[PDB]
Amino acid sequence: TLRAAVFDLDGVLALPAVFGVLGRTEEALALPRGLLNDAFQKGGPEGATTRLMKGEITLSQWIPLMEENCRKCSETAKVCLPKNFSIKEIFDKAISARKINRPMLQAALMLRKKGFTTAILTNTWLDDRAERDGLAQLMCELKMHFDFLIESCQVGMVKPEPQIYKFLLDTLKASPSEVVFLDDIGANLKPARDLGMVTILVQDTDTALKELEKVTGIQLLNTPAPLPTSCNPSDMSHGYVTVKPRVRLHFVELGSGPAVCLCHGFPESWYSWRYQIPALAQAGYRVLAMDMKGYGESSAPPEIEEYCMEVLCKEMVTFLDKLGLSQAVFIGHDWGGMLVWYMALFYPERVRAVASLNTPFIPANPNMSPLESIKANPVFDYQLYFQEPGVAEAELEQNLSRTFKSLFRASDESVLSMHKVCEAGGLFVNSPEEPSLSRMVTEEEIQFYVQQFKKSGFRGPLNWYRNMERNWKWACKSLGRKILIPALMVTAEKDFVLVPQMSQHMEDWIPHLKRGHIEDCGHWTQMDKPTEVNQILIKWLDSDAR
Amino acid sequence: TLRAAVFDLDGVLALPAVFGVLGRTEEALALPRGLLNDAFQKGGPEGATTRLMKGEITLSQWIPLMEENCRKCSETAKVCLPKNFSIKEIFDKAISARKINRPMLQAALMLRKKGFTTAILTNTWLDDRAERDGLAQLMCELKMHFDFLIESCQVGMVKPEPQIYKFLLDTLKASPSEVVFLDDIGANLKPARDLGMVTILVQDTDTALKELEKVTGIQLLNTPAPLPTSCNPSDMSHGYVTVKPRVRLHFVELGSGPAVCLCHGFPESWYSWRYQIPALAQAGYRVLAMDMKGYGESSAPPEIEEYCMEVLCKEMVTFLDKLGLSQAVFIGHDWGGMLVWYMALFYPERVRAVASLNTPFIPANPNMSPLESIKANPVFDYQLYFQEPGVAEAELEQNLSRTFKSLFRASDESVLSMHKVCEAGGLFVNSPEEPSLSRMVTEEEIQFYVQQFKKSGFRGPLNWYRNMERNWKWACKSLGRKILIPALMVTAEKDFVLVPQMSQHMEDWIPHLKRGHIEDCGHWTQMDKPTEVNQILIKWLDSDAR
Ligand SMILES: Nc1nnc(-c2cccs2)s1
Ligand SMILES: Nc1nnc(-c2cccs2)s1
């Protein structure tokens, strides 16, 4: 009975294998067969390639040595060698060509999900090429999905030598009969078999996946589309910035490149972006997912006026200043979406681009009080319930577990109408005291939000809704302006509060507005349809935010 | 008696003023004089320019309106208007041309240093141009040097209207007789005078600086070259990453662009890079200045083996992985310099570039014990004193204030030889119990290091020196390798331990090695000669690390 799975990198997790490269280059350049291949393997264990795979020498030191082998493989080949030719040029190209085998990676993720210990055991080198980043990026993406990554150049042992397998078993803390081993090389498989490890010869992915699933007893092939990678809070980089004497903002940071600032709504967390953070980081961006003021590890001052839009926006500007960022792309959801439009309207120079999920840009109505405006429609009734201090805090605070389980639901599962809330006298009056756990969420995920809200409660978060009059006055200054910086509005078909039709008139203030639409999507866009959200944002960032 | 100084931005802190632009463009394009100028000012207070300066409209909304004024200034000019002509093109160019007036900025820094309240009061606009980053970058750099930045577009008031001056006094919390006001526009000065504020008409910098210093009584002109900008710990972004269950690394982060990782030596702090962090961030890099394991806010495990180079390097690799960085430029000093060479030797793919201050790359001597090697020379005697656990911790821990004051000295001031340390039986046996405060440091700076070392002490820091045998064995694996990635070695003339001559043979392992040399520089390079260090690193980063 297995509990561990081991994968090779070249030809198993990454395709096409370089092995094909020398062979394919031979065919295109019409040199004698295996000639390029002999150069690679000249001297076998005492040769330049074995020294390279053992970490004895770097790749750049190896290039002239391999080129050496081409002097003589050819002398003994009695075949003319072309100029314009570079060993370096071929390898550069072949490595650039290697991409992750997603179905294989998906199978490893599934095994690990079912309590399997996964590892990568590979024959690799120390890469010092000017172009080394490409490979390093590939390794960075792959390694985080496995319990272990064993590289020959770091351990000083190579496949097929038996000590590396005995080394792997040690790291795994498992007996060979408990190990599945997948490799594209016959010679490298043989020593694992001698130890009694289960082996798979990888020739083509579907067949190897067939052998893997029948031996494991887990469905790996034809599986429903998986969920994007999610963050483990304990494994993130946690950032803290004091924006003013009593205000400290907490954020989570991942990736390199242009700064993308993620702004959650009510009653959320930086954690509401768990599916977006790794996807956006992998897409070539530096993600900063905030704990907005009043939430999680960020300061939660009691005063209502500390949560007016003008004050909230100034703090976001200070946050950028203190991090040394002249600009950031601002992506918001719900309340964060509202703040994000106002960031674009009042600080266009500090905003690289603006994107909103569900939240339409609402211009201030001069000659109509926000109370009359909010009162016109039955959907925004919950906002009136939030007006008087203590009432909503008391209801939301009583059972944090029930609060999050009732709120975080897909459109089909909804347990609360949100109308007649003031009349019902509660957000949870028609709700079970022990709600069913939604398909969108996990018990562990619910517990995380419970842990976050236990510190400061709902007072600061509810205060965002208690500055209606102040926000109206401030917004009246931007009445003559237009948003002319890149902007994206993403609508969710099944959001019954932030309805897609509410955004129809947006082009009047935002002429170059780009749109995204998500079907069968409730209010909680990020967790509801993570794959679609990630595709829209990434495609938009790449075209509009560099 | 003054306590506050106010500066205009255009023509005062930033040169050349845009005012010259329309005038200069007129001369080059031979259009009637002031024609371009009338277009700008058409309608005065009710005009497009006043609406723009009040934040009523953005710059992109303003462009067609100004262009409007050119229809008619010209109709009433009876002069032909050229095609290929863009208002946008002229303004783009003029704004790009505006650079900080360093002598003016230096005078403001000096006033603030002497307890003055400094502010920027400017007539500006909301910039939504595709090229807005350039201006935002300029503002980001300037604003951090002043107590306040008052912009007309944010406050909705413009100069010369009297309400803005009454507004400024309010923000300053000062009476007009206590305020110096500097402007390049005569009309804008007049309302400040009416309030009884001290005024300076800025025409050329030297003369205005002359008037400023005679009224203030502070030396501003001809002053000795100033120290680079330094970090205030309380105002930095503090980052925390768990690299393993019991190990957490703390770092300070500033700027955007390619990741530059700063590694301090013994017995230092991320704070030892205070002069480099803002300079490197301003130069277009993302600075991550670490608290190395055993120091400050980072975990300090008691076990000696937790500080061997192999373990320390793996943790730096994990730190990058957890931040989502495939690479970082690694800059080290002392012990950090040693770690940085080993990062280049063992993880060349994760290192964008490597730079060392004082620390030469020391290859392992096979067939010579590190103890014999260290023992060959009298300079490394302090390393033997550090060998036995508790002895050096007890001496260094007794008076933290005395410890840092004795150690942190320029070459001239040195209070300790470092030879006969084991014989003297102490690092401080020939030292005053109340040492003089060095020119390199401030009492407040000393107190910061005292605060940092009070938490974990000297055990973890001293452990870096207690893995001699282990480090030797590990380094013996890299004996066949060479460092072929971009590398910079910076030597300090007056470092009597990490002597420049010790680096002579470095080109043998590092062929493309670039060098920097600093004269009259002791062991503490970063604080000793901050200006030179910053110039060498920036010039090197720009040519070799993109
Ligand atoms: N309670 C509130 N509902 N909407 C508000 C708005 C603030 C700014 C634009 S709309 S405050
Ligand atoms: N105490 C020590 N002195 N030098 C050491 C070295 C470690 C690695 C290269 S040199 S350990």
- Which CATH number do you get for residue B59? 1.10.150.240
Task: Specify if A373 maps to a domain.
Answer: yes
Q: Is residue B523 flagged as an active site residue?
A: yes
Task: Count CA atoms within 13 Å of residue A279 on its CB side.
Answer: 20
Q: Parallel, antiparallel, or unpaired: how do β-strands B237-244 and A237-244 relate?
A: antiparallel
Question: For chains A and B, what is the number of CB pairs under 8 angstroms?
Answer: 159
Examine residue B228 and state whether it is found in any structural domain, yes or no.
no
Indicate if A149 and A201 belong to the same structural domain: yes
Q: Which three-class secondary structure state does DSSP give residue B476?
A: helix
CA distances from A263 to A216, A295, A486 (A): 42, 12, 17
**∠B359-B362-B364 over CA atoms, to 5°?**
155
Q: Report if residue A275 sits inside a domain.
A: yes
Residue written as tokens 């953070």? A277
Q: At which residue do the structure tokens 């090695």 appear?
A: B513
Q: Are residues B190 and B137 in the same domain?
A: yes
- Token look-up 């970490």 returns A55
CA distances from B422 to A216, B380, B400, B408, B415 (A): 63, 11, 21, 21, 17
C-alpha to C-alpha distance for B168 and B164, rounded to whole angstroms: 6
**CA angle (A47, A50, A53) in 5-degree steps:** 150
Label the pairing between strands B14-15 and B4-7.
unpaired
Residue B471's Cβ-count burial label (10 Å; 0-12, 13-18, 19+) is: buried
Gap from CA of B469 to ligand 2 centroid (Å): 8
Nearest to B489 by CA among B478, B502, B472, B471: B502
Spell out the residues 6+ positions from residue A541 whose beta carbon is closer than 8 angstroms to its own: A260, A280, A283, A285, A329, A353
Check B477 against A234: CB less than 8 A apart: no
B318: contact with A, CB 8 A cutoff:
no
The count of domains in chain B is 3
Chain centroid to Cα B138, Å, comes to 15
- In the block, tokens 């003031």 appear at A422
Q: What is the 3-state secondary structure (H, E, C) of B181-221?
A: EEECCHHHHHHHHHCCCEEEECCCHHHHHHHHHHHHCCCCC
Annotate A457-507 with three-state secondary structure.
CCHHHHHCCCCHHHHHHHHHHHCCCCCCCCEEEEEECCCCCCCHHHHCCHH
Same structural domain, A88 and A111 = no
**Taking chain B, what is the end-to-end CA distance rounded to the nearest angstrom?**
50
Element (H, E) at B88: helix B87-97
In a shared domain, residues B345 and B273: yes
Question: Would residue A228 count as lying in a domain?
Answer: no
- Do B112 and B48 share a structural domain? no
Contact yes or no for A228/A530 (Cβ under 8 A): yes
Quick one: closest CA in A to B48, which residue? A480
Enter the tokens of residue B14.
Answer: 């930033």
Please tell me whether residues A389 and A310 are part of one structural domain.
yes
State the smallest CA–CA distance between residue A33 and chain B in angstroms: 32
Q: Cβ contact (<8 Å) for B326 and A236?
A: no
CB neighbour list of residue A329: distance below 8 Å, 6 or more residues apart? A258, A259, A260, A261, A285, A351, A352, A353, A354, A355, A541, A545
Q: State the residue for tokens 């330049």.
A: A48
Structure-token pair, residue A525 = 């866009």
Q: What angle do CA B463, B464, B465 make, to 5 degrees?
A: 85
The amino acid at residue B487 is A
Helix boundaries (H) for B118-161: 133-143, 152-155
**3-state DSSP assignment of residue B245:** coil
Residues B348 and B464 in one domain: yes
Query: B228 with B530: CB under 8 angstroms?
Result: yes
CA dihedral A536, A537, A539, A541 (to 10 degrees): 160
B64 φ, ψ to 5°? -60, -35
Burial class (CB in 10 A: 0-12, 13-18, 19+), A388: exposed
**Structural contact between residues B207 and B32, judged by C-beta atoms closer than 8 angstroms:** no
Instruction: Return d(Cα A282, Cα A218) in angstroms, integer.
Output: 28
- Quick one: A111 and A75 in the same domain? no
The residue written with tokens 């305020």 in the block is: B179
The three-state secondary structure class of A248 is strand
One-letter amino acid at A92 equals D
Whose CA is closest to atom 8 on ligand 1? A471
| CA dist., res. A177 & res. B67, Å (int) | 80
From A422's Cα to the closest Cα of chain B, the distance in A is 38
How far, in Å, is the centroid of ligand 1 from the Cα of A421?
A: 18
Q: Which residues of A198-230 are buried (b: 16+ CB within 10 A; e: fewer)?
A: bbbebeebeebbebbbeebebebbeeeeeebbb
Q: Are A431 and A425 in contact (CB under 8 A)?
A: no
Spot the catalytic one: A334, A381, A495, A528: A334
> Angle formed by the axes of helices A87-97 and A18-29, to 10°?
130
Q: Dihedral of the CA atoms B17, B18, B20, B22 (nearest 10)?
A: 180
Distance B261 CA to ligand 2 centre (A): 21
Please name the helix (run of DSSP H) or strand (run of DSSP E) that holds residue B87, with its range, or none.
Answer: helix B87-97
- Label the pairing between strands A328-333 and A259-263: parallel
CA pair distance A374, A380, nearest whole angstrom: 6
Q: Report the alpha-carbon distance of residue A338 to residue A360 in Å, rounded.
A: 8
Closest-approach residue (CA) in chain B for A310: B154
Distance between first and last Cα of chain A: 50
- The count of other CB atoms within 10 Å of the CB of residue A236 is 23
When computed from its CA atoms, the radius of gyration of chain B, rounded to whole angstroms, is 29
Per-residue exposure over A70-80, b if at least 16 CB sit within 10 Å of its own CB, e if not? beebbeebeee
Note the resolution in Å, 1 decimal.
2.5
A261 three-class SS: strand
Check CB contact of A237 with chain B, cutoff 8 Å: yes
Q: What is the rounded CA–CA span in Å between residue B123 and residue B146?
A: 17
Strand partners, B120: B7, B149
Cα A90 to Cα A4: distance, rounded to the nearest angstrom: 36
d(CA A293, CA A307) in angstroms, rounded, equals 8
Tell me if B230 is assigned to some domain: no
Residue B304 counted as domain residue = yes
Pairwise CA distance, residues B130 & B387, whole Å: 60
The neighbour count for residue A477, using CB atoms within 10 Å, is 18
Residue that the structure tokens 């007049």 belong to: B190
Name residue B238's beta-bridge partners. Answer: A240, B252
Domain closes at, from A32, A64, A96? A96
CB burial of B428-438 (b: ≥16 within 10 Å; e: otherwise) equals beebeeebeeb
Residue B342 token pair = 């080993």
DSSP 8-state code for residue A110: H
CA dihedral A456, A457, A458, A464 (to 10 degrees): 10
- Classified as helix, coil or strand, A299 is coil
Q: Are B126 and A348 in contact (CB under 8 A)?
A: yes
CB atoms within 10 A of CB B166: 13
Cβ contacts of residue B130 below 8 Å, gap of 6+? none
Structural method:
X-ray
Does A382 belong to an annotated binding site? yes
How far apart CA B222 and CA B215 sit, in angstroms, is: 16
Partners of B179 in beta bridges: B4
Q: Quick one: tokens of A141? A: 């993406």
Task: Report how far residue B233's alpha carbon sits from residue B251's, in angstroms, rounded to the nearest whole number.
Answer: 11
The Cα–Cα gap between B222 and A212 comes to 78
Phi and psi at residue A187, in whole multiples of 5°?
-60, -40
| Annotated binding residue A122 | yes
Closest CA to A235 of B296, B319, B238: B319
Q: Does B349 contact A139 at a Cβ distance shorter than 8 Å?
A: yes
In the reported structure, the alpha carbon of residue B314 is separated from the centroid of ligand 1 by a whole-number distance in angstroms of 49
Do both B481 and B426 map to the same domain?
yes
The annotation status of A37 as a binding-site residue, yes or no, is: no
Handedness of CA A318, A319, A322, A325 (dihedral sign): negative
| DSSP-derived secondary structure letter, B409 | -
C-beta atoms surrounding B492 within 10 Å = 27
User: Is residue A38 part of an annotated ligand binding site?
Assistant: no
DSSP summary character for residue B406: H
Q: What angle do CA A498, A500, A506 make, to 5 degrees?
A: 100
Among A56, A139, A256, the residue to mutate for chain B (most B Cβ within 10 A): A256
Asked whether residue B525 is marked as a ligand-binding residue, the answer is no
Decide if B277 contacts B463 (C-beta within 8 A).
no
- Token pair of A388 as six digits: 């008087």
Among A173, A188, A217, which residue terminates a domain?
A: A217
Query: Cβ–Cβ of A326/B136 closer than 8 Å?
Result: yes
Which residues are within 8 A (CB) of B437 and not within 5 positions of it... i.e. 6 or more apart?
A: B405, B443, B446
| Cα B478 to averaged position of ligand 2 atoms, centre (Å) | 14
Helix (H, G, I), strand (E, B) or coil at A114: coil
**Does residue B203 form part of some domain?**
yes
CA-CA-CA-CA torsion sign (A346, A350, A352, A357)? negative
**Alpha helical stretches, state H, A54-161:** 59-75, 87-97, 102-113, 133-143, 152-155
CA distance A77 to B383: 58
Name the active-site residue from B271, B295, B385, B465.
B465
Contact of B315 with chain A, judged by CB distance below 8 Å, is answered with: no
Structural domain includes residue B225: no
Active site residue A523: yes
CB B520 within 8 A of CB B493: yes
Decide: residue B112, CB within 10 A, 0-12 exposed, 13-18 middle, 19+ buried. middle
Rounded to whole angstroms, the maximal C-alpha distance in chain A is 94
Contacts of B290 in chain A (CB under 8 A): none
Q: Which of B264, B295, B523, B528 is catalytic?
A: B523
Q: Do A335 and A382 belong to one domain?
A: yes
Convert A384-403 into a string of H (helix), E (strand) and C (coil): HHCCCCCHHHHHHHHCHHHH
How far CA A25 is from CA of A80, A85, A93, B162, B236, in Å, comes to 15, 11, 11, 78, 53
Residue A269: which CATH number?
3.40.50.1820
Per the CB < 8 A criterion, the answer to whether A383 and A360 are in contact is no
- Enumerate the β-bridge partners of residue B287: B254, B260
B334 is catalytic: yes
For position A122, which CATH number holds? 3.40.50.1000
B348 touches A: beta carbon within 8 Å: yes
CA distance B525 to B529: 6
| A481 contacts A341 by C-beta, under 8 angstroms | no
Task: Name every residue whose Cβ is closer than 8 Å to that of residue B423 and which is 6 or more positions away in sequence.
Answer: none
Question: What is the distance between the alpha carbons of residues B428 and B435, in angstroms, rounded to a whole number?
Answer: 11
Does B184 carry a binding-site annotation? yes
With a CB cutoff of 8 Å and minimum separation 6, the contacts of B118 are B4, B5, B6, B7, B108, B111, B112, B145, B146, B147, B148
Length of chain A: 546
**Structure token digits, residue A510:** 């935002």
Judge if the upstream peptide bond of residue A45 is cis by omega within 30 degrees of 0: no
Cα B106–B111–B114 angle (5° rounding)?
130
What distance in Å separates the CA atoms of residue B119 and residue A5, rounded to the nearest whole number?
Answer: 64
Residues B369, B475 contacting (CB under 8 angstroms): no
Torsion of CA A346, A351, A357, A359, to 10 degrees: 0
**Cβ neighbours around A169 below 10 Å, total:** 19
Which of B143, B322, B485 is nearest residue A128 as measured by Cβ atoms? B485
Burial of A115 (0-12, 13-18, 19+ CB in 10 A): exposed
Cα A445–B239–B140 angle (5° rounding)? 115
Nearest ligand to the CA atom of B381: 2
Q: Give yes or no: residues A403 and A533 share one domain.
A: yes
Ligand 2 pocket at CB < 6 A: B 309, 338, 362, 374, 383, 465, 468, 471, 475
Of all ligands present, the nearest one to the C-alpha of A342 is 1
CA distance A164 to chain B (A): 17
Separation CA B82–CA B72 (nearest Å): 14
Pick from B192, B246, B245, B183: nearest CA to B212: B183
Between the CA of A269 and the centroid of ligand 1 the distance, in Å, is: 20
- Residue B377 identity (one-letter amino acid): N
CA distance A398 to A400: 6
Q: What distance in Å separates the CA atoms of residue B153 and residue A168, rounded to the nearest whole number?
A: 65
| Eight-class DSSP state of A3 | -
In this structure, are A449 and A418 located in the same domain?
yes
Residue where a domain stops, chosen among A61, A96, A131? A96
Residues in contact with B320: Cβ distance below 8 Å, sequence separation at least 6, in sequence order: B326, B327, B328, B350
- Across B217-338, where does the E strand assignment appear? 237-244, 247-254, 259-263, 286-291, 328-333
Which of residues 128 through 157 in chain B touch A, CB cutoff 8 A? 128, 132-133, 135-137, 139-140, 143-144, 154, 156
- Print the domain residue range for B76: 17-96
